[PDB]
Each structure stands twice: as structure tokens, then as C-alpha cells.
Amino acid sequence: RMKQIEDKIEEIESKQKKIENEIARIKKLLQLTVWGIKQLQARIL
Amino acid sequence: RMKQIEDKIEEIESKQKKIENEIARIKKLLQLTVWGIKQLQARIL
Amino acid sequence: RMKQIEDKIEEIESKQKKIENEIARIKKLLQLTVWGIKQLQARIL
Amino acid sequence: XGXXXXXXXXXXXXX
Amino acid sequence: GXXXXXXXXXXXXX
Hints:
The structure holds 5 chains of a larger assembly.
Chain A: H1 2-44
Chain D: H1 10-13
């Protein structure tokens, strides 16, 4: 049972690392879209 | 101990799935916002 | 062996909490950018 | 802000 | 710092 638990933990940790990396990617792209919106607004106004 | 651990893992796994689903949803909407910015930029330029 | 497991669950649970908090903040900023796009489009159209 | 904005965009809802 | 240019760089290269 301890082994099955350990294997599940290994799967969870791996997925957490993937999710952390995706969050970092999302934040960078989101920052770009904020910057884009600021540029568009300044032109429109 | 071992059953206590097994229950916490199950709860963790279920929260992980919810997180994965939310990340997927976020990515789809971020892609639409990128696309909408692309259309706006070209139209005003 | 079970101690190392209980300790890993502690580390995973707090990391999961960090992830949830980050996803909540990304969702708010995404909601803001969608709002800003809507305003820009309404203005030009 | 479930509204707000104004003020030329409020610097993007204050971030 | 920054950079960009190029019409938006195709959205900062994604």
C-alpha cells in the first residue's frame, strides 16, 4: 500500500510541476495582452 | 496512518483534476482574447 | 517510510493551495482583459 | 472592480 | 528592457 501511495505521489508531483509551468506561461501571455490593450486604448483615445 | 494517507491522496487527486480543468478553460479564453486583440489592432491601424 | 509520505503530502497540499490562489488571480486579470476588449470594441464600432 | 473602471481605465483595474 | 516592435511580434511570439 505504501508503494501504491508513493507512486501516486510521484504522479501528483509531476502534474504539479507541469501545472506550475503552465501557470508561469499563462501569466507571461496575460501580461502581453494587458500591454496590448494599453497600446490599443491609447491609440483609440 | 496508511488509510488516512490514502484518503488525503484521493482528495488531492480530485482537486488536481479541478485545477487541470480550470487551467484548460483559462487557456481557451486567453486564446480568444489574443485573437480579439489581433482583430482590433488591424482594424484601427 | 510513512513519515516521508506524510511530509510529502504536507508539501503537496500547500503547493496545491499556492496554485489555487494563483489561478484565482489569473481569472480576475483575465476577466479584466475581457472587459477591456469589450470596451475597446464598443468604442470603435 | 463588479464594476468601477472609469478614470480612463483606472490603470487596468489597478492590476 | 522590453523590445517588441514588428507590428506586435505576432503577440510577443505567443
